[PDB]
Swiss-Prot record, chains A, B:
Full-sequence portion shown in this chain: 389 to 456 of 1040
Biological function: Catalytic component of the RAG complex, a multiprotein complex that mediates the DNA cleavage phase during V(D)J recombination. V(D)J recombination assembles a diverse repertoire of immunoglobulin and T-cell receptor genes in developing B and T-lymphocytes through rearrangement of different V (variable), in some cases D (diversity), and J (joining) gene segments. In the RAG complex, RAG1 mediates the DNA-binding to the conserved recombination signal sequences (RSS) and catalyzes the DNA cleavage activities by introducing a double-strand break between the RSS and the adjacent coding segment.
Organism: Mus musculus
Regions recorded as binding DNA: 1-68
Protein name: V(D)J recombination-activating protein 1
Subcellular location: Nucleus
PTM comment text: Autoubiquitinated in the presence of CDC34/UBCH3.
Effect after changing residue 3 to L: Impairs DNA-binding and hairpin formation while maintaining some nicking activity
Record lineage: Eukaryota, Metazoa, Chordata, Craniata, Vertebrata
Length: 68, 68
DNA sequence: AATTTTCAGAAACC
DNA sequence: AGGTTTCTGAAAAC
DNA sequence: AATTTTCAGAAACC
DNA sequence: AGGTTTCTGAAAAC
């Protein structure tokens, strides 16, 4: 069997980190090979584009206001 | 040769989208296989954890204030 | 609106 | 002139 | 602080 | 009791 997974956003940062770990690595590898190891800018843009792909322009704008 | 790349954050959303495209796919695949296709929550958490991994807790808190 | 791929052309490099 | 890759936008499709 | 991997135990499933 | 995977935190290292 195995313990059922909780939602990612309900987990401790610790447990969150443990689940994304394998993707965190893929992102790292990509950031290095293609974007000069700029994980922040990559994940930021992934998220922003992910928001705008959903027409959550208001939040996307607000995060953009936060980041400069 | 080839045209030199601009910084990801200076590009049009169009051009940004074109560069991350290959990683966008990897994220999609991961989100589907491991997080019930919840790209938003994945990228959000990747970014949040990426910020806190850099002790940018203030911004991380502010994005967390935005998202609920 | 968004998405996607295709077609074009200019721009920046060789 | 040619090459290339990147950037932009439009175009034609979902 | 952060990171990492290791060790533990409890928790939730079979 | 056993199994498993997940979650949490501590522990020992950078």
């Amino acid at each position: 069997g195995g313990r059922p997974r909780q939602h990612l956003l309900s987990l401790t940062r610790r447990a969150q980190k443990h689940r994304l770990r394998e993707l965190k690595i893929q992102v790292k590898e990509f950031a290095d090979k293609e974007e000069g190891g700029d994980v922040k800018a990559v994940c930021l843009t992934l998220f922003l584009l992910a928001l705008r792909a959903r027409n959550e322009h208001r939040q996307a704008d607000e995060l953009e206001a936060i980041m400069q």
